[PDB]
Amino acid sequence: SGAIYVGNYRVVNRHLATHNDWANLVWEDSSRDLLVSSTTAQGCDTIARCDCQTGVYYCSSRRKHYPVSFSKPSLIFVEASEYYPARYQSHLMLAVGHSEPGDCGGILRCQHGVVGIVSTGGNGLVGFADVRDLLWLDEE
Ligand SMILES: Nc1cccc(OCc2ccccc2)c1
């Protein structure tokens, strides 16, 4: 589980988004596993605007922060899960790391701020849904 709180936006995994997130929907993209919803309160998370390929992510199934190398966001084939059929997920960054289903929402951070959230796992790899291309998260 997990979210980014930037401005009056909540960024979650589309597959973990609640009634209220859907009731307050701003933008959603099945192919990226992202849902942004509106919030009353103002968030403090700064989104990274950069091309960093190193970072730390939080893994609830280990209660551990792991430094990682990750790929640039790409169209990555992701096996069938309890939430999506086997398909290509867009804007996905892979690293060598531990990621179970309930690790989704774990933040990946570089020195610039939030890079994205855990979205995929399996085969000793963790997938991060990039949010750094979403410029509008920082305004309006
Ligand atoms: N590379 C880097 C530099 C500075 C901070 C940073 O934050 C890591 C982190 C903090 C809290 C939750 C999850 C991850 C990563």
Ligand SMILES: [Zn+2]
């Ligand atoms: Zn960065």
